[PDB]
Amino acid sequence: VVGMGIVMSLIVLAIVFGNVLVITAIAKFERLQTVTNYFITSLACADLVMGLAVVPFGAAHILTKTWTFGNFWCEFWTSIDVLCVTASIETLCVIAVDRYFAITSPFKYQSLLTKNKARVIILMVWIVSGLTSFLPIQMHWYRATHQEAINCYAEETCCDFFTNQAYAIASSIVSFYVPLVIMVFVYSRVFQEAKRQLQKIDKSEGRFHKEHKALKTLGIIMGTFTLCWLPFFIVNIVHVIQDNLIRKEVYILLNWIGYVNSGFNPLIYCRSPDFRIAFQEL
Amino acid sequence: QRNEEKAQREANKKIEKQLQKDKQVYRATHRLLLLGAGESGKSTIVKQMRIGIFETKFQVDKVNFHMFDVGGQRDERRKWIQCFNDVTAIIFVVASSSYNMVIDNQTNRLQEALNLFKSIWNNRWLRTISVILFLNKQDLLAEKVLAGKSKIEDYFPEFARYTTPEDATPEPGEDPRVTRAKYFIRDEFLRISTASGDGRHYCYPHFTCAVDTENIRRVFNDCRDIIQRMHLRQYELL
Amino acid sequence: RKLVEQLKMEANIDRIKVSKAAADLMAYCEAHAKEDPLLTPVPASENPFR
Amino acid sequence: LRQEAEQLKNQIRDARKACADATLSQITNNIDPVGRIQMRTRRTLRGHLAKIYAMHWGTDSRLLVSASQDGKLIIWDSYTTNKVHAIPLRSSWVMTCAYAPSGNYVACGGLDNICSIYNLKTREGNVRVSRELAGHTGYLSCCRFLDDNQIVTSSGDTTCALWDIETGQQTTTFTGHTGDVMSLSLAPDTRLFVSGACDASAKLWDVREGMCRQTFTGHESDINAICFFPNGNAFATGSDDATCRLFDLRADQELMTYSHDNIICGITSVSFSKSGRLLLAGYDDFNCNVWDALKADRAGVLAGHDNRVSCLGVTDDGMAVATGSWDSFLKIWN
Ligand SMILES: Nc1nc2c(ncn2[C@@H]2O[C@H](COP(=O)(O)OP(=O)(O)OP(=O)(O)O)[C@@H](O)[C@H]2O)c(=O)[nH]1
Ligand SMILES: CN[C@@H]1CCc2c(ccc(O)c2O)[C@H]1O
């Protein structure tokens, strides 16, 4: 437990810096403000909030092995975590659908999407995530029934997560599993379109002059998110379907593995040459 | 005082509202530039497409298109071509049956068209705009090949060692000699294009006559691929 | 034909030394230097764009 | 008859060199350097849907007019950043704009080979076309208002002409250039004007007599911009070979060259300050530079544009500098 504090401090600093750099780069320069960039700033803001007000308290609670702030602050922390995770995951699905519309139908992309519709979509996503997180927690619709939960609820030095099976399943389904199928279908269709378009160039001018460019990008984009957030949303359902199967430390480790995905996001969605020039400017 | 300021603000608001209304219809239209050599046949093409400067409005599949021809003005140094660096595509019309005639004394008109296309392709401002190429006057070319004391070898030396490509789809009524001559002219233009391409723009060759009615379809399908390839390259999947 | 006449007309023109022209230009620039808002920044109360 | 022309050219060249007593560099060696000049943007005008190719200031330093290729002609109010008018255009290809000295009329032109005049101050109505000036073979490149009734235009058919707005007729025409004419600028007293063409030459016409007077052949590439020194006895030129030169009417030869090894891009516009000490020129590399006239030493740089700069102007009172670019934005400096 010597270098763990340094490692977590480095994680927090990297998350914060990688988010603020993108935020100021988008806000300062007018040429980067497009329809697509409005989703990236929302994702960056969600990741920044998660890195600011979620992981430091968790790190402190892990180090001290106790909670010294009260019940209200522990519940507030948990709601914030569920909200920032839920509001961060769905922006990826929104971006995937945007790319699907842009590539599949190019003559209707300009008319289909406008600034007002983008703002409406962002507001709807944030409202849905907030409704998922803040309401069922503060109203106490998730607390368990066994004696361990009752013992931990009635004292101010215990901060542990306990939920019933139904709420865990509902939260997992709304937060993770639903966007996954949409993203997979969208990216498969985009890959099909890219391959069908690349075949025509070979058919036309092949003798005067594959699919290794789309494969790398799609693999990175899908694999990072899937490997970061897949095990947690399996063990979350497993440990409530049949208890006495998963240890706590495994749960915390997988949840924290999911956490760091917020730091890898700017390294994937901000590699454009314009973004690189803007970063080099500052 | 504020009496004039209120009226000024109202006028500015009305102007801004009108500009916002006009931007929506401006951003949802496609512009094309029609280029061609002398006596190529671009006027017939634009006349069938419709049904100082020459402009045309036409709509296909609920998509607004704007094709405009530029006056020749007897200009050999095109200083006005830097304006047209934001068009969707460029339509190039060439007469493939004009290999034998000579423009007063110079190379044959086919060689003149090749020089113009090479200069057009390698331009500082047109380093992104794609080209749609129409090889007009197909029926006259067949008559010259099928009969007459005119040989492409005499005017073009490279035709001696040229062989028909395997990946060809000749028409059922095409003669074996005509297919050889039609393709040789086609790869002359493609050869210039492939070498200088940065992968930012491509060339689309077509065979055209003065009677076919699918030309407006070819512009529609080819202009759809131009935008789609742009999006794929931007997102780094092409 | 026309070019010969044009150059003949342009050949006979009075010319002065370069030193005189340079001196006149520098004298004008020095004389009109005080009243130039771009050479000498104007007070912040004077300029209407600030 | 080419021998006579060659002999006359040789005689002219010999006569020009004999009057070069010294150079401007030696005379202005003891002048105190101007120093460093820094300007900051004060206003930014928005509302153009495409690139901007023209701009002109009014006689009163408040109002200015800009032209774009989306088919619009917007009149601004730089003091408060308020749009006053917006004139739709019949042709979307426009390359020039002008503002009449009295402010009553505004002119425009482009690839349609036609110059149009709009009557701004109309009784119980809106802005509408007052006259269309036709009969010019090539695309227009520039146009300036001599008076409320006359106008001078230049096109790409190697000629310039003087019109009469009331009747729409060509009072006189000027010929002699062997290439496309790119710009022009009138004298302060509107008695003479100059023109730079694509054959790397500049001439000095006479409005009343309608004949050329002098010819200057300093540049190596084509000419893109011409301006007149506040005094009226000199002018500056900008070319595509990344150099600017200062010519003199009385001495009839070049005086100075404004070139640097770092810059390898052409000049799109030039202009002078009111005192005639600073020479500001646009460039193809998205920014503008300030050149000291008397010492040919750069004294500043204006870098705030995201695309190529296409126009440049300075107010009559010498209080601001307006620039336009291909990103559909205007900026006012200092
Ligand atoms: N028989 C036949 N005539 C054709 C064909 N294509 C073009 N033409 C001839 O072309 C004539 C009109 O086209 P052009 O003479 O090239 O005039 P243009 O179309 O304005 O071309 P430019 O003058 O170069 O601008 C028609 O009168 C036809 O006789 C063709 O496929 N078959
Ligand atoms: C301990 N932190 C919480 C616990 C459960 C949970 C998370 C995130 C999204 C969900 O849908 C959840 O059900 C985690 O961030």
Swiss-Prot record, chain A:
(S)-timolol binds at D81, T86, N236, N255, Y259. One of its GO terms (cellular component) is endosome membrane. The chain holds residues 33 to 339 of 413 of the full protein. (S)-carazolol binds at D81, S171, N255. The modification Phosphotyrosine is found at Y109. GO terms for molecular function: adenylate cyclase binding; amyloid-beta binding; beta2-adrenergic receptor activity; identical protein binding; norepinephrine binding; potassium channel regulator activity; protein homodimerization activity; protein-containing complex binding. Palmitoylated. Palmitoylation may reduce accessibility of phosphorylation sites by anchoring the receptor to the plasma membrane. Could be depalmitoylated by LYPLA1 at the plasma membrane. Changing D47N: Affects binding of catecholamines, and produces an uncoupling between the receptor and stimulatory G proteins. It is a multi-pass membrane protein. This is Beta-2 adrenergic receptor. Residues 64-74, 143-164, 242-248 are extracellular. Beta-adrenergic receptors mediate the catecholamine-induced activation of adenylate cyclase through the action of G proteins. The beta-2-adrenergic receptor binds epinephrine with an approximately 30-fold greater affinity than it does norepinephrine. Belongs to the G-protein coupled receptor 1 family. Adrenergic receptor subfamily. ADRB2 sub-subfamily. The lineage of its organism: Eukaryota, Metazoa, Chordata, Craniata, Vertebrata. It comes from Homo sapiens (Human).
Curated annotation (Swiss-Prot), chain B:
There is a cross-link at K144 (Glycyl lysine isopeptide (Lys-Gly) (interchain with G-Cter in ubiquitin)). GO terms for cellular component: cytoplasm; cytosol; extracellular exosome; heterotrimeric G-protein complex; membrane; plasma membrane; trans-Golgi network membrane. Residues 132-139 are annotated as: G4 motif. Changing E236K: In PHP1C; significantly reduces receptor-mediated activation; displays normal receptor-independent activation. It is a lipid-anchor. It catalyses: GTP + H2O = GDP + phosphate + H(+). Changing A210S: In PHP1A; the patient also shows testotoxicosis; constitutively activates adenylyl cyclase in vitro; rapidly degraded at 37 degrees resulting in loss of Gs activity. The modification Phosphoserine is found at S196. Residues 1-12 have a biased composition (Basic and acidic residues). SUPFAM superfamilies: P-loop containing nucleoside triphosphate hydrolases, Transducin (alpha subunit), insertion domain. Residues 65-74 are annotated as: G3 motif. GTP binds at residues 36-44, 69-73, 136-139, 210. Belongs to the G-alpha family. G(s) subfamily. It is linked to Albright hereditary osteodystrophy: A disorder characterized by short stature, obesity, round facies, brachydactyly and subcutaneous calcification. It is often associated with pseudohypoparathyoidism, hypocalcemia and elevated PTH levels. Pseudohypoparathyroidism 1A: A disorder characterized by end-organ resistance to parathyroid hormone, hypocalcemia and hyperphosphatemia. It is commonly associated with Albright hereditary osteodystrophy whose features are short stature, obesity, round facies, short metacarpals and ectopic calcification.
UniProtKB/Swiss-Prot annotation, chain C:
GO terms for molecular function: G-protein beta-subunit binding. It is a lipid-anchor. It comes from the Eukaryota. The keyword Ubl conjugation does not apply. Expressed in fetal tissues, including testis, adrenal gland, brain, white blood cells and brain. One of its GO terms (biological process) is G protein-coupled receptor signaling pathway. Its main location: membrane. The keyword Lipoprotein applies. Disulfide bonds: none annotated. Keywords: Acetylation, Cell membrane, Host-virus interaction, Lipoprotein, Membrane, Methylation, Prenylation, Transducer. It is found in: Cell membrane. Coiled coil: none annotated. GO terms for cellular component: extracellular exosome; heterotrimeric G-protein complex; membrane; plasma membrane; synapse. Belongs to the G protein gamma family. Guanine nucleotide-binding proteins (G proteins) are involved as a modulator or transducer in various transmembrane signaling systems. The beta and gamma chains are required for the GTPase activity, for replacement of GDP by GTP, and for G protein-effector interaction. This is Guanine nucleotide-binding protein G(I)/G(S)/G(O) subunit gamma-2. The chain holds residues 13 to 62 of 71 of the full protein.
Curated annotation (Swiss-Prot), chain D:
The modification Phosphohistidine is found at H260. One of its GO terms (molecular function) is GTPase binding. Phosphorylation at His-260 by NDKB contributes to G protein activation by increasing the high energetic phosphate transfer onto GDP. Changing K331Q: In MRD42; uncertain significance; no effect on protein abundance; no effect on complex formation with gamma subunit; no effect on trimer formation with alpha and gamma subunits; no effect on receptor-driven G protein activation. Keywords: Acetylation, Disease variant, Host-virus interaction, Intellectual disability, Phosphoprotein, Repeat, Transducer, WD repeat. InterPro entries: G-protein_beta_WD-40_rep (IPR020472), Gprotein_B (IPR001632), Guanine_nucleotide-bd_bsu (IPR016346), WD40/YVTN_repeat-like_dom_sf (IPR015943), WD40_repeat_CS (IPR019775), WD40_repeat_dom_sf (IPR036322), WD40_rpt (IPR001680). GO terms for cellular component: cytoplasm; cytosol; extracellular exosome; extracellular vesicle; heterotrimeric G-protein complex; lysosomal membrane; membrane; photoreceptor disc membrane. It comes from the Eukaryota. Changing R90L: In MRD42; decreases receptor-driven G protein activation; decreases trimer formation with alpha and gamma subunit; no effect on protein abundance; no effect on complex formation with gamma subunit. CDD domains: WD40. Pfam families: WD40_Gbeta (PF25391). The keyword Repeat applies. SUPFAM superfamilies: WD40 repeat-like (SSF50978). One of its GO terms (biological process) is cell population proliferation. The keyword Amino-acid biosynthesis does not apply. Belongs to the WD repeat G protein beta family. The gene is GNB1.
